[PDB]
Amino acid sequence: GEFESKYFEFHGVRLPPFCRGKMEEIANFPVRPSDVWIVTYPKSGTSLLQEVVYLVSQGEQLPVLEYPQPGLDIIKELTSPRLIKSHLPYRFLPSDLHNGDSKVIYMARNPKDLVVSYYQFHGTFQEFCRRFMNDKLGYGSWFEHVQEFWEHRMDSNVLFLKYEDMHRDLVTMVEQLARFLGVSCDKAQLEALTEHCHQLVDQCCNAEALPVGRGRVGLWKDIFTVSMNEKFDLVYKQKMGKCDLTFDFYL
């Protein structure tokens, strides 16, 4: 696990090696009330939802807190309002966020598309999927990462979003974000801002009215074999447990 430093094992969670020696500094990271924290499972292919949030907050570019670059020292001195990305589980986030400070948006995605995206990000797909099912990837069990943010979705500084809802209902979503983030609009400004989010999304879309590539919903169906999928579903039901979280696996 930590053999040859491949991973850094922290309180039962396998983290990338670059997380070693800074979990105390992140726990203590001073959060500003005007910060916007975007959390995603790694390589989950939600960039487009990220662009929409960025666009909303104003009615390679975004730093990751725990990454080698730009580093925590640069992130401390960034001018407000800061847009800060992380892949850490809720529990490993700055302790200020656990007390209700600032605003954390978690972007979930159904786990079948997410494994394809992760695998296609730039190894058989099948070993990768197996490593995913056996909780072997950096940042830990996906089932744990998602269920912890779902459990906190009613918290006042937490908005749990699902990637697929951005395609089924962008309108609800954009306003949900506007209100969460205290971006105050009259009617017309909300209609306009929504139409900008729409145009920005639609510009990646094809005849499915869905993005082409890793951000496509139902992508997994073209990749998973029948047995792979039967093995997945079985793991998924077993690891999800009593959790009442559901996804759209296609649109």
Kindly report the number of other CB atoms within 10 A of residue 159's CB atom. 20
- CA 141, CA 39: separation in Å to the nearest integer? 15
Tell me the β-bridge partners of 105. Answer: 38, 159
How far is 130 from 124, CA to CA, in rounded Å? 10
The vertex-184 CA angle with 183 and 189, nearest 5°, equals 105
Distance between CA atoms of residues 69 and 65, nearest Å: 9
Alpha-carbon distance values, 91 to 20, 94, 156 (Å): 16, 8, 16
Beta bridge partners of 104: 37, 158
In sequence order, the β-bridge partners of residue 108 are 162
160, 147, 138, 129: which is closest to 42 by C-alpha? 138
Nearest to 173 by CA among 39, 51, 89, 41: 51
Q: Quickly tell me which residue has 């559901």 as its tokens.
A: 246
Q: Which of 87, 122, 167, 198 is catalytic?
A: 87
Amino acid type, 123:
G
SS3 state at 211: strand
- Give the pairing of strands 103-108 and 158-162: parallel
Residue 65 burial (10 A CB sphere; 0-12, 13-18, 19+): buried
> Residue 29: enclosing H or E segment and its boundaries?
none
Q: How far is residue 240's CA from residue 146's CA, in Å, rounded to a whole number?
A: 10
- 123: containing domain: 1-251
Q: Is 172 helix (H, G, I), strand (E, B) or coil?
A: helix
d(CA 226, CA 229): 5
Is residue 87 part of the annotated active site? The answer reads yes
Total domains in the fold of the chain: 1
* CATH number assigned to the domain comprising residue 152: 3.40.50.300
**Residue closest to 215 by CA, chosen among 39, 36, 50:** 50
89/167 Cα distance (integer angstroms): 25
Count the residues in the chain. 251
Please enumerate in sequence order all residues whose Cβ is within 8 A of that of 95, keeping only pairs 6 or more positions apart, or say none. 27, 28
**Cα-Cα-Cα-Cα dihedral sign, residues 144, 246, 158, 156:** negative
In degrees to the nearest 10, what's the CA dihedral of 205, 210, 212, 215? 120
| Helix 111-120 × helix 226-240 angle, to 10° | 120
One-letter-per-residue 3-state SS of 51-99: HHHHHHCCCCCCCECCCCCCCHHHHHHCCCCCEEEECCCHHHCCHHHHC
List CB contacts of 19: < 8 A, sequence separation 6 or more: 8, 10, 66, 88
- Burial class of residue 11 (count of CB atoms within 10 Å of its CB; 0-12, 13-18, 19+): exposed
